[PDB]
């Protein structure tokens, strides 16, 4: 004698793709994320719920990627163009107490640029890094003149990352995996529901993962397909590895009018001696840390396999070096000193570049205005992006190299524990009751 009952308000969810909204506690992210988070998120423990997660197919990553690029372009949208600087430069060597390094890295370039009046020109000069200057056949071109427009970032604008929270719109919920040592895929048995994710800083890096969540309990290695050497491996460490970076040269600036209220910020003379930029990694910490990674890697390959580390392969600087954005300055750090040992203080030199093709796009080049004084950076290495070597039969030794370069993985590593579902409150069930 069972009859149909129609129920509304049923606690059932289904996987869904919706748009999430940014939440925050002249900074770009901070200004754009107006909604303020709930100071005390009402996390719900879900008793007797098993759910399947898949970090490699998680669309939350795609939204973070899209929002970052869009906001990036928006903040630069109203800024002065540097088209007037795409002229022949007359460059000579800088000779001011320069140390053994950087012998060819810093140049003194003069050029003919217009003034506010369209019928007059001025001769000005500025310093450039060799990475952005191309020889023609003393005569040099800016490196991006043959490909794209170069714009200047507005000097007041800050890109310093702030922990940004992604929140579900009403009608949706974010489920999260609390299992310790979660694989990144498959069923998770310790789960809960949240309205907003933890805040994630949109940190930009290419080889090491910086300022992310630190793994609980042990080093965790996650991959889409461990036997496929075409895939990146995301390694999350369970202890931080402090890194100290600097750009020791004392800079100054000059502001040049290039048009009617239009200004260019040029790099001025270096005050005092000229020294090379670099990063410090504690040697002992790195040694032990890498050994921990190896033990964890062996779990997937065998107890008789040697793991060798090696440096990066060829390619663009965004690939071959570890890109690091600090103070708005762009560093390109040589990490070969971190991947030299074979598992039977480290100084990393860094170069400075100002015209940056930040994304995988080529038509939008941005010029990072110079920074005065000197800078110091302190950060937490929380993980690695690694790849396997090519095919072979000798399993005795495997070689791993720095991978990455695809920034979506920098968010995948934080969003791996979250899933978005929609709620469908309506459904039916039998009961001993009829009209």
């Amino acid at each position: 004698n069972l009859w149909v009952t129609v129920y509304y308000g049923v606690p059932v969810w289904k996987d869904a793709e919706t748009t999430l909204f940014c939440a925050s506690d002249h900074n770009v992210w901070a200004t754009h994320c107006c909604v303020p988070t709930d100071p005390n998120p009402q996390e719900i423990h879900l008793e007797n719920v098993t759910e399947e997660f898949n970090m490699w197919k998680n669309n939350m990553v795609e939204q973070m990627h899209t929002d970052i690029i869009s906001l990036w372009d928006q903040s630069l949208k109203p800024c002065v163009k540097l088209t007037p600087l795409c002229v022949t430069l007359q460059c000579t060597n800088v000779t001011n107490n320069i140390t053994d390094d950087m012998r060819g890295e810093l140049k003194n370039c003069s050029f003919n640029m217009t003034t506010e009046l369209r019928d007059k020109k001025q001769k000005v000069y500025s310093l450039f890094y060799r990475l952005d200057v191309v020889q023609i056949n003393k005569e040099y071109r800016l490196i991006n003149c043959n490909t794209s427009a170069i714009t200047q970032a507005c000097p007041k604008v800050s890109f310093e990352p702030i922990p940004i929270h992604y929140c579900a719109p009403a009608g949706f919920a974010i489920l999260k995996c609390k299992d310790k040592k979660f694989n990144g895929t498959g069923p998770c048995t310790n789960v809960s529901t949240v309205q907003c994710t933890h805040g994630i800083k949109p940190v930009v890096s290419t080889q090491l993962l910086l300022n992310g969540s630190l793994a609980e309990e042990e080093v965790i290695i996650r991959s889409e397909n461990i036997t496929n050497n075409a895939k990146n491996i995301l390694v999350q460490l369970n202890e931080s590895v402090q890194i100290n970076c600097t750009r020791p040269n004392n800079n100054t600036r000059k502001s040049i009018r290039i048009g009617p209220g239009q200004w260019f910020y040029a790099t001025g003379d270096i005050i005092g001696d000229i020294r090379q930029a670099h990063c410090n990694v504690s040697k002992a910490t790195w040694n032990e840390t890498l050994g921990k990674v190896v033990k964890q890697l062996r779990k997937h390959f065998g107890n008789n396999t040697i793991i060798r580390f090696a440096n990066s392969s060829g390619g663009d600087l965004e690939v071959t070096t570890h890109s690091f954005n600090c103070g708005g300055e762009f560093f390109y750090c040589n990490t070969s000193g971190l991947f030299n040992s074979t598992w039977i203080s480290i100084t990393l030199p860094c170069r400075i570049k100002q015209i940056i093709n930040m994304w995988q796009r080529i038509g939008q080049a941005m010029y990072a205005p110079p920074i005065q004084g000197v800078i110091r950076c302190v950060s937490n290495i929380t993980g690695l992006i690694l790849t396997r070597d090519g095919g072979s039969t000798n399993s005795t030794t495997e070689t791993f190299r720095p991978g990455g370069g695809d920034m979506r993985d920098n968010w995948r590593s934080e969003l791996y524990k979250y899933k978005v579902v929609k709620i469908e409150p309506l459904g039916v069930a039998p009961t001993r009751c009829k009209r």
Binding site: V12, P36, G171
Partner: protein
Amino acid sequence: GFLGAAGSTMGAASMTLTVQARNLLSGIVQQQSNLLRAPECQQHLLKLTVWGIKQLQARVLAVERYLRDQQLLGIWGCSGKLICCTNVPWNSTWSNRNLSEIWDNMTWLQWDKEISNYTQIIYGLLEESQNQQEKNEQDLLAL
């Protein structure tokens, strides 16, 4: 208690149906209230043509999903009810169980696999039944 007891037996889980029903529209209004807490920031979102459109689409879709379900319940004669019964028998081959085999420590999340593809069949039946009852009243009220 948004989705609390989601893993509990359906019979017990029903105690919070009222919360879930309220959550959608309450959440929509409060989320708008929260954004407007700081007009000084919010006004700059008017420059993000794309976010303007995406948020409006999200809000509109949530409303549309709400109305769709409410209209359907109204058609079935369940307007204003969370646990309404109809005069349509529970067909045995849907579940092939007794009532305690439905509520045999089974959750709503699990129940979804049992209904599976019978969902549209049952919805059609529910509308057909109401159509006949309404017609009957139209003539019974004219005697």
